[PDB]
Design a protein around this ligand. Structure first.
Ligand code: GTP
Ligand code: GTP
Ligand code: GDP
Ligand code: GDP
Ligand code: MG
Ligand code: MG
Lengths: 427, 38, 98, 252, 433, 427, 216
């Protein structure tokens, strides 16, 4: 009996999780007033994983919403499912961060984490058997990347046996949106390396490529990008909530996907994605799901896996299919281009099958990939870091709060050795 | 239903919980009763 | 302050029904749902051993007159004291007399 | 963290077993039609069946007309608690008598004027002539009767402690009543006269000489709610005239 | 038929009794005009007439002619008996001497007579409820005279208090340590139990729990009325483990001079946040022991608990109460005296608390009121000790007191009795081995 | 034929007796109107043990209900069998006992005995051959502990050669609902040992443990514990009313059970108790009832029998059954673990068989056991007493009501020597 | 006289036992609820209520499949207490299911196994249904085998274990468990029949004309 505590840091994490609860409340058939009015009684089998019970049978999510500004709280309380959230879970500061890891991590961020943990600890202690923690945040900012990492490095010692899950928005390759985002990204992922069992890297430029090429949506607002992130966000914790042929919770996807504890940076992917003008021309067969999830154009990370080697691969399927087609397809896509998988590990594909598809799809699939292509994402952040740091530019906004050169050198050294150990274990 | 920024505006003025949007609303109980979705 | 706060409230009847639920949940389950085992009637087991073994002379019109040996249970199964005619209750006319 | 009765958490299987088997017992009781909602609904619908009182073609009431026993509205205030008014005599399954705040023939309200001596049906009722009041019982065409007896230490009224009135199946002189004119000096002249139908008259038990009285200050709380109590006591004013509460009207 | 007579003394008394009797009228089907349109035993607090009119069996006494008189021209002007609202022409004006010796004995005859006319109608009169404040003149002077007369006239009967203790660092007056200490000098020998409440503790729990700022006195009188209603709930309704007024007295005070338990109310939640929480018995009991949700500004971790009288309310099950208590007893941050091994009293009532429209609490389903006496109240007496020590060495504000009947020498006796009370409180909280 | 007079004292005694008379009326076929609707003459031959025959064929129980506050007696009169009790047997006062043994024994509980004793003499002088008296109460209150013990003393004074039975609900060790509970328990035990022939010890938390771990109820309340206590109580007078192959009345359960007159304290038990899930998948036989009747977790008193030693043991079986395995099983349970039976008495198990089981069951059994582990239940009461009495805590509520300080010392010394008397028979 | 007790361990064991006991109920006259409208004594034991309860023990750490059995079409046939269920999963780890999470439920399953042997007179077999690649069937089955060899001795236990296949593979850490449980069990069992799923895929799709078979 397993339960997940979901954490939301900053503007990006607040919007992403406010969309996630929108996609979960209709999977479990929950009204905006909190009442359950779903289709089948299978939805109330494992509602405990994401929902508490209020008076009168209402269901409220087990989510903690944090920031240092009340503007995003005003945005998420004015959304569709704003009144289902717990009002005591809206913890906010009076002054913002504004793209500073130092003030979001040391002084203003640390002035709020006591009030955050006074709710998080109560929620975890009310749980009967809590299984893991979930965090939605962005590394390129100041309130998510600082206060979320401080929360990660404060709950890890309190609950050292649980599962840390992170939903990180890594900076995009082609176009940036903050000039100090290499600094915050490097510091955030330096904290992320040693206090997290698995991270799920998401890039917005790859999502633009998906929403323009695959879905033919030529005005991709942030709502559809949040759709895409949130769909694979719910497609990974599906065997907990619904029965199937082969089940897999977050710990089962941990053991088969992180061999060595510093190599736990993945890339996601959601299989059934077709444009409205290509709907009737696409057969709904399990081979087509396998083709679309295993192409490099359905990756939320801006990394081509042609260069690197897939160490281990996860694939969780929803809907009604035979195990023979899933097994045959995945064994044969391993066997055809066997030069893109490591030969030291004999078999690399993890299989899980759940019996309930999302509401409206015949069947679905979800890709998680450990590869030696994520270190390429870390290289360019390292080059931007050393380019910005060798001239000591944009640095006086950090050392005026408590930083020094030693943390920056330690973080750069950590990314250098992480790239080195990613390279050592490809060949 | 009241926005958080409005709540802070109402907290800045010295409203004695009878003009505040915390404890008072214009909707009656019939507005709450028929506020379902199905 | 008094005439603004202490205003009569029209159409405010009290809650006189949740206390019924609170009393009934502490009354407890009836005896059917706690001690009665095989959904059993209140007419079945009302037979004296004297009235079965002398008055009706071990009647039971469903046992074989000769017992038989089984392969699984290594005893001659039909036990004339183990299947004691869970049937007509012991009457002798005290009800009609009273 | 405690959840609700649809989700598999903690102990759930035993609650499912108990819920399913309680459901089975309730469904068996429902199919047999012995639930107390169903028994109460049938008893209520028997009690409230629409009856048709008989019209009076000559303005008098005869023997065998289905009639009513209503109490006129009085403005007198002996006590400061009061049932509003227009009370009709009704049978209450506590067999039980009570005055009720209704004025439509509902089946537990309709009485049939029966005979005591050798009087054929259709003969006109008269002042000082004995008659019996009959009502239909539950699930049977057996005539109950309005009857009263002397007041003992064991048989009296419910909330007042005066002479009782009940319904019974026994036929005797405890079964009989007679109608009297309310005006006391015009009583002996108005003996052989026929009774006009809807007129204020006085009904006395022939064996106890006590008139029927509907106590308006004694409220009886039943399933229909807030009815009065009827007994047999002859009240008088200081001018040797009966109270307004002793009077009764026969509605056709 | 087990009725209680309430006595409200002073401005605090009438302003608390207004909210109390409004909640009493609301929890039954009582209209403000006294008319009613199974287990509702309202006869313990409302009499009955021939017209079904229900009058409260309470007296509202105050020496100032404003607050009681303004009750007579409001919503509830038809509810109370006209002769049960005793008012005076000249107030005590922050003077224990004035309301104890000059205005007291002169008006006490009518109050005693009205109590006697209320008491002859009683059949099973259980006790008296006295509402007053320590810092006032009427509520400290005339209340104690009422104590003296009630005790000499009724003898062995319960006399329960809901007294407003002075707040430790904030106050509305300056001569209030004199009045408070003088009235505690004559309360200890003539009281049975004194449930203690403050004002600034209720300010803090209004700020941090109901999420309101700037409350008025009615906004605290609602909570005080909720506490009073839950305390006397088991006498008006039925329950699994009913607790009467005698159980507050025979199960809470170990010695006849320790009768000061602190009060607190557990589910103090606002209507914008109430329906998002699971208000079960575990978190309604753990919140009742917290150092921030008491009606007296004092930290119970400074002292040791003597006895706890938990009164429960609503759809509560005794197994949850036992599990919640067993959770409490495994906490080492919360201590008990060694001579009290059990240390708890549990009362269960079925009727959930009725909400008042226009109030600030919600339609909750469960409620807990606690009454616990703790050695940490000796910290509260030390501040009044030091304040009278500061104000009495210079003989400030004494010429007002000695001109109204009393002498200089009674401040000395009050000082000696409070020093003795501090000695008793210190001596109780030690070990035996 | 041998009549039994029932006495009820206090809230706990009144509710237990209210739940007991409905079980007795169920097994004798008495409806709530009092008439007979059973279908055997075995239910009508010996109905005079518990019921008198009123006019019109209705049966009224021979029970006296005693209390000091009318709160719970209204609920008793609103019980499902509330109209079968005689209104004149309802004796109740207007002022409570205030959880005080002293005032409920001398001040408020001693002026009401002039009517209770008149009622008891009235309904025990119409019976032909009176066997004894039956009392149910709780030692942790002020009505049952205070007034009930005075009732026991006066009844023993007036009827010296009858049988006085007692189902006392002693205070539980872990959970308690009264601070002055040890004073009442100490002052009641001393008067119990001077005027009782048999006394059964029932602990509320042992009942809760039985309901939680065997019946597997999620919400066990007071009615279920009252049902268990009443099912035990009806299983000890079964040979009075129904026939059998080996009869044993209350006196046979005395002479075979108390060797020394101060040792008459037992711990009861009920054999066929199971959850609703496993109720259809178990078979009622002798080796299933005797396996869990001697089990440590099926006892109604919170004393582990593996700590102590069984002095002498009783087991009264019901229903049609064989006499060989009822001897074989209780010889094997005596010879396998011979260290828990004391050795200066060769046999220790008393066997009684009735042939009419409780309604809804095929067979059932009742356990009566005197052990040296019952002194654990008195050592902690004496420890709490000497922790409280040495400081004179709550003593002015006892001293000022007409009691001397030496009564506590005398009662505590009597119970301490009772404890030390059980210690001799263990080693 | 020849009663057998089946021990289904893991998701593979429970899903095998569902089909196995469907076949067993079909072979004899056993209704899906357990009623019968005398060869069944080696698999089914009668009670006093007329039911034919199975002589099987269903265990799994992760509750979902046993919960599915509890709410399936065979709810009234199985005892509520032969379905032993933990809270945490096995997480594809031999270490967890053998040392940390597997040693707090071994007492109840051993008590149920000992309880099952009481109604039987001629027990001579134990059947173990588990998988070598998972966590429950590799960790918890091994420790149960050690305890069964300790407290029963010479009763023959035979295992029908699902082995890894050369081409198909569900998991990655599967060779570790497949070596470890066959190192532990090797001295504590009597006969081990091996099965791999690719073989039955081949058998179904050649010997029959069936295409895309499932696990059932
Ligand atoms: N918490 C709270 N405190 C109150 C309330 N009403 C009065 N008080 C306090 O009680 C103290 C005593 O004031 P009063 O009750 O007016 O004094 P009095 O009884 O009128 O005596 P005099 O002023 O001499 O007439 C004040 O200082 C207030 O702090 C109330 O409604 N709630
Ligand atoms: N033939 C067959 N194999 C199965 C079936 N179900 C599961 N398996 C095999 O079982 C293996 C993994 O399941 P488990 O051994 O139960 O792994 P686990 O961690 O113990 O999973 P849980 O039992 O749920 O805790 C897979 O490699 C499958 O090959 C089935 O129904 N039929
Ligand atoms: N996909 C996605 N990205 C977002 C969303 N909101 C913000 N971002 C990204 O967040 C980055 C800026 O981070 P920001 O939230 O302003 O920093 P923070 O406020 O300190 O957490 C930009 O590069 C955006 O692409 C969203 O709803 N969806
Ligand atoms: N088992 C059981 N315990 C009860 C019942 N009624 C009360 N109790 C327990 O008895 C203890 C004290 O009972 P008490 O109220 O003092 O009874 P009193 O002597 O009549 O006042 C409480 O802790 C209750 O838990 C009951 O019906 N059954
Ligand atoms: Mg004043
Ligand atoms: Mg599982």
């Amino acid at each position: 009996m397993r339960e997940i505590v979901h954490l939301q840091a900053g503007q990006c994490g607040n919007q992403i999780g406010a969309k996630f609860w929108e996609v979960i409340s209709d999977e479990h058939g929950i009204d905006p007033t909190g009442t359950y009015h779903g289709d089948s009684d299978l939805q109330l089998e494992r509602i405990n994983v994401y929902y508490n019970e209020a008076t009168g049978g209402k269901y409220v999510p087990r989510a903690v919403l944090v920031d240092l500004e009340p503007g995003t709280m005003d945005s998420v309380r004015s959304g569709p499912f704003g009144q289902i959230f717990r009002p005591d879970n809206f913890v906010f500061g009076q002054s913002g961060a504004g793209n500073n890891w130092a003030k979001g991590h040391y002084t203003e961020g640390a002035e709020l984490v006591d009030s955050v943990l006074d709710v998080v600890r109560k929620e975890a202690e009310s749980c009967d058997c809590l299984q893991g923690f979930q965090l939605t945040h962005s590394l390129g900012g100041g309130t998510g990347s600082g206060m979320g990492t401080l929360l990660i490095s404060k709950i890890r010692e309190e609950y050292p046996d649980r599962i840390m899950n992170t939903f990180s928005v890594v900076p995009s390759p082609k176009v940036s949106d903050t000039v100090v985002e290499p600094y915050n990204a490097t510091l955030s992922v330096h904290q992320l390396v040693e206090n997290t069992d698995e991270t799920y890297c998401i890039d917005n430029e790859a999502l633009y490529d998906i929403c323009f090429r695959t879905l033919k949506l030529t005005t991709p607002t942030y709502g559809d990008l949040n759709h895409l992130v949130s769909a694979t966000m719910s497609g990974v914790t599906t065997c907990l909530r619904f029965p199937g042929q082969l089940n897999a919770d977050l710990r089962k996807l941990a053991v088969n996907m992180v061999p060595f504890p510093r190599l736990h940076f993945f890339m996601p992917g959601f299989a059934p994605l077709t444009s409205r003008g290509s709907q009737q021309y696409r057969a709904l067969t399990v081979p087509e799901l396998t083709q679309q999830m295993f192409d490099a154009k359905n990756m939320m990370a801006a990394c081509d896996p042609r260069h690197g080697r897939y160490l281990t691969v996860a694939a969780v399927f929803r809907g009604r299919m035979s195990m023979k087609e899933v097994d045959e397809q995945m064994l044969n896509v391993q066997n055809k281009n066997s030069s893109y998988f490591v030969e030291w590990i004999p078999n690399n594909v993890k299989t899980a099958v759940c019996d309930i598809p999302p509401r409206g799809l015949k069947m679905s699939a979800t890709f998680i990939g450990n590869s030696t292509a994520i270190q390429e994402l870390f290289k360019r952040i390292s080059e931007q870091f050393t380019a910005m740091f060798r001239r000591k530019a944009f640095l006086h906004w950090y050392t005026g709060e408590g930083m020094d050169e030693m943390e920056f050198t330690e973080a750069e050294s950590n990314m250098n050795d992480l790239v080195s150990e990613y390279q050592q274990y490809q060949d | 239903l009241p926005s958080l920024r409005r709540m802070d505006m109402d907290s800045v003025k010295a409203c004695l919980s009878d003009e505040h949007c915390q404890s008072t609303t214009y909707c009656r109980k019939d507005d709450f009763d028929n506020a379902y979705f199905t | 302050i008094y005439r603004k706060e202490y205003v009569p409230f029209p159409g405010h009847r009290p809650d006189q029904i949740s206390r019924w639920y609170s009393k009934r949940t502490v009354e407890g389950l009836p005896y059917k749902y706690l001690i009665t085992h095989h959904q059993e009637p209140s007419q079945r087991y009302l037979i004296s051993t004297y009235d079965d073994h002398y008055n009706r002379h071990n009647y039971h019109p469903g046992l074989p007159e000769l017992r038989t040996w089984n392969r699984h249970k290594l005893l001659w199964l039909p036990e004339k004291a183990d299947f004691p005619l869970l049937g007509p209750p012991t009457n002798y006319g005290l009800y009609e007399q009273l | 963290n405690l959840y609700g009765p649809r989700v598999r958490i903690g102990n759930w299987n035993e609650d499912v077993y108990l819920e399913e088997e309680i459901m089975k017992d309730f469904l068996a009781k429902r199919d047999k039609g012995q639930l107390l909602i169903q028994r109460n609904r049938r008893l209520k619908e028997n009690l409230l069946r629409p009856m048709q009182l008989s019209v009076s073609e000559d303005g008098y009431i005869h023997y065998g007309d289905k009639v009513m026993l209503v109490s006129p509205d009085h403005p007198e205030t002996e006590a400061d608690l009061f049932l509003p008014g227009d009370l009709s005599l009704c049978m209450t399954p506590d067999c039980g008598l009570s005055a009720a705040q209704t004025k439509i023939p509902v089946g537990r309200n309709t009485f049939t004027i029966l005979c005591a001596a050798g009087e054929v049906i259709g003969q006109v009722l008269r002042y000082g002539q004995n008659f019996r009041l009959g009502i239909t019982g539950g699930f049977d065409d057996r005539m109950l009767y309005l009857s009263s007896d002397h007041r003992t230490l064991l048989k009296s009224s419910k909330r007042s402690w005066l002479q009782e009135v009940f319904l019974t199946h026994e036929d005797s002189y405890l079964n009989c009543w007679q109608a009297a004119f309310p005006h006391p000096q015009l009583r002996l002249e108005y003996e052989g006269s026929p009774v006009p139908a809807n007129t204020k008259i006085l009904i006395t038990h022939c064996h106890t000489n006590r008139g029927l009285v509907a106590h308006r200050h004694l409220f009886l709380r039943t399933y229909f709610g807030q009815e009065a109590e009827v007994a047999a006591h002859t009240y008088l004013d200081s001018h040797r005239v009966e109270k307004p509460k002793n009077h009764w009207m026969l509605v056709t | 038929m087990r009725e209680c007579i309430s006595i409200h003394v002073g401005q605090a008394g009438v302003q608390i009794g207004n909210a109390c009797w409004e909640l009493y009228c609301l929890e039954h089907g009582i209209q403000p005009d006294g008319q009613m349109p199974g287990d509702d035993s309202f006869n313990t607090f409302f009499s009955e007439t021939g017209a079904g009119k229900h009058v409260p069996r309470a007296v509202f006494v105050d020496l100032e002619p404003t607050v009681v008189d303004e009750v007579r021209t409001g919503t509830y002007r038809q509810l109370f008996h006209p002769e049960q609202l005793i008012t005076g022409k000249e107030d005590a004006a922050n003077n224990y001497a004035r309301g104890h010796y000059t205005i007291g004995k002169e008006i006490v005859d009518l109050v005693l007579d009205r109590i006697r006319k209320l008491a002859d109608l009683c059949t099973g009169l259980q006790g008296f409820l006295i509402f007053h404040s320590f810092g006032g003149g009427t509520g400290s002077g005339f209340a104690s005279l009422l104590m003296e007369r009630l005790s000499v006239d009724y003898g062995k009967k319960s006399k329960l208090e809901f007294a407003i203790y002075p707040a430790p660092q904030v106050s509305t007056a300056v001569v209030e340590p004199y009045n408070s200490i003088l009235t505690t000098h004559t309360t200890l020998e003539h009281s049975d139990c004194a449930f203690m409440v403050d004002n600034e503790a209720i300010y803090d729990i209004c700020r941090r729990n109901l999420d309101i700022e700037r409350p008025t006195y009615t906004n605290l009188n609602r909570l005080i009325g909720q506490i009073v209603s839950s305390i006397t709930a088991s006498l008006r309704f039925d329950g699994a483990l009913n607790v009467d007024l005698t159980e507050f007295q025979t199960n809470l005070v170990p010695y006849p001079r320790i009768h000061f338990p602190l009060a607190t109310y557990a589910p103090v939640i606002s209507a914008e946040k109430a329906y998002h929480e699971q208000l079960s018995v575990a978190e309604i009991t753990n919140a009742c022991f917290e150092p921030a949700n008491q009606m007296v500004k004092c930290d119970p971790r400074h002292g040791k608990y003597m006895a706890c009288c938990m009164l429960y309310r609503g759809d509560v099950v005794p197994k949850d109460v036992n599990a919640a208590i067993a959770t409490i007893k495994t906490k080492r941050t919360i201590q008990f005296v060694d001579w009290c091994p059990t240390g708890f009293k549990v009362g269960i009532n079925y009727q959930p608390p009725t909400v008042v429209p226009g109030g600030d609490l919600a339609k909750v389903q469960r409620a807990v009121c606690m009454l616990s006496n703790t050695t940490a109240i000796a910290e509260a007496w030390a501040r009044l000790d030091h304040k009278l020590d500061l104000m009495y060495a210079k003989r400030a504000f004494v010429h007002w007191y000695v001109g109204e009947g009393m002498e200089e020498g009674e401040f000395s006796e009050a000082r000696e009795d409070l020093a003795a009370l501090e000695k008793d409180y210190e001596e109780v909280g030690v070990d035996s081995v």
